[PDB]
Amino acid sequence: ETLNGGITDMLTELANFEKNVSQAIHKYNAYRKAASVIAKYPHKIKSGAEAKKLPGVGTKIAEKIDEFLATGKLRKLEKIRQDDTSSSINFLTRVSGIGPSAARKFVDEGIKTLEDLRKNEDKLNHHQRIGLKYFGDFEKRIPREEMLQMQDIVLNEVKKVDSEYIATVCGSFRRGAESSGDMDVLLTHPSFTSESTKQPKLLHQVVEQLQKVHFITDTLSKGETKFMGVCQLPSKNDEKEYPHRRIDIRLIPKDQYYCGVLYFTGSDIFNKNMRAHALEKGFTINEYTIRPLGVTGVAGEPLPVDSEKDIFDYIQWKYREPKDRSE
DNA sequence: CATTAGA
DNA sequence: TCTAATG
Ligand SMILES: [K+]
Ligand SMILES: [K+]
């Protein structure tokens, strides 16, 4: 957590590099299990050799550990850090819709900057265009105070369209968080569950609502179960317009809400931990259901869930307010 | 790890 | 169809 920090930090830098700038999925994966292992190890690595006794730790890596230990740096890291192409790729990637593969291509063609991207809007796809168009606001945080104004509107049209809808704004928002990165709305309807052959409209109706009133301003992607968009709070009585915000809406079979909701509320650890516990408690939890364990090794058969509680009860734990689902 | 665009 | 990108 801190005794082998520089090593893990260096290592992740290393990995991340092979993956993006290079297409070394392998080296990439290498730097990672290592970074992973050296992290668990309870003692200060004092030499590569020492490191090296680890699993995943080879001669390539170990050598890097000495250099890093010896001198507070690493050239390869220093060289990459300087590297314009590579820098370039790192940046392009910040554009929503740009991933490594496109980043490399764009660079290939010579589009290394924001302005470059501009002049060539033609080379970009809708998603990419939008991300470009909203590069600044996409990077901005979402203050809760706004999260509250967003949730407000959201729940309103949802209700207006059909009163039978159930929505929840998940994520760290749900967990307290002073601010968030984007808004995550989980959606369901009684009329749609595991079997009940869809109702694509179910999603459509609301997107259309939100649009109708200008909550929604763009669409990155719209499918029959997962809508990914851009939204904006009504710019008041002027002098202050709001930044464009990423919003994601998802349809869910009512019969899988709460687990979905559980899960997406996190946190990453609260989850893992509650989950680890359902294992002892003779269960299995995951984004959609909660099945009881069977001695033979594994088992099935989804237990019925009508609330976050059902799940809690089941693993015979203390209902944890989302506020304190921190870990 | 599943859903969507796209080409 | 596959492959990329988000989450
Ligand atoms: K080893
Ligand atoms: K990106």
Residue after which a domain boundary falls, among A231, A263, A295: A263
Question: What type of residue sits at position A106?
Answer: F
CB of A103 under 7 A from strand C? yes
Same domain as A250, residue A166: yes
Position A282: which residue type?
Answer: G
Check whether residue A108 and residue A70 sit in a common domain: no
Among residues A50, A83, A116, which one ends one of the domains? A83
Contact A322, A265 (CB under 8 A): yes
Q: Is A92 helix (H, G, I), strand (E, B) or coil?
A: helix
Structural tokens at position A298: 């594994």
A196 and A100 share one domain = no
Residue A57, annotated ligand binder? yes
Q: Is A98 annotated as a binding residue?
A: yes
CB A312 within 8 A of CB A320: yes
* Domain membership of residue A268 as a residue range: 264-326
Expressed in Å, this structure's resolution amounts to: 2.8
Same-domain check for residues A29 and A100: no
Taking the centre of ligand 2 as the mean of its atom positions, its distance from the CA of residue A96, in whole angstroms, is: 4
Relative to beta strand A289-292, strand A283-286 is antiparallel
Q: Same domain, yes or no, for A258 and A171? A: yes
Residues in chain A: 327
Q: Are strands A245-253 and A226-231 parallel, antiparallel or unpaired?
A: antiparallel
Closest to A251 in 3D by CA, of A303, A199, A310, A211: A199
**Closest by CA position to A320, among listed A268, A265, A281:** A265
Last-in-domain residue among A45, A65, A83: A83
Residue pair A45/A7 in contact (Cβ under 8 Å)? The answer is yes
Question: A79: CA distance to ligand 1 center in Å?
Answer: 27
**Whole-angstrom distance, CA of residue A164 vs CA of residue A121:** 42
Catalytic residue status for A159: no
Residues A111 and A151 in one domain: no
Kind of pairing between the strands at A183-189 and A166-169: antiparallel
Answer for A199: CB within 7 Å of strand B.
no
Answer whether the bond into residue A22 is a cis peptide, omega within 30°.
no
Please, are residues A302 and A289 in contact by the beta-carbon 8 Å criterion? yes
CB atoms inside a 10 Å sphere around CB A248: 17
To the question of whether residue A88 is assigned a binding role by annotation, the answer is no
Same structural domain, A258 and A269:
no
Is residue A123 domain-shared with residue A89, that is, in the same domain?
yes
- Considering the domain architecture, whether residues A145 and A222 belong to the same structural domain is answered as yes
Q: How far is the CA of A248 from the C1' of C7 (A)?
A: 9
Same domain (yes/no): A183, A97: no
Distance A125 CA to B6 C1' (A): 9
Same domain, A149 and A234: yes
Choose the catalytic residue: A64, A123, A133, A309: A64
Count: domains in chain A: 4
Q: In terms of domains, do A255 and A270 share one?
A: no
Q: Nearest residue to B3 (CA, C1')? A: A226
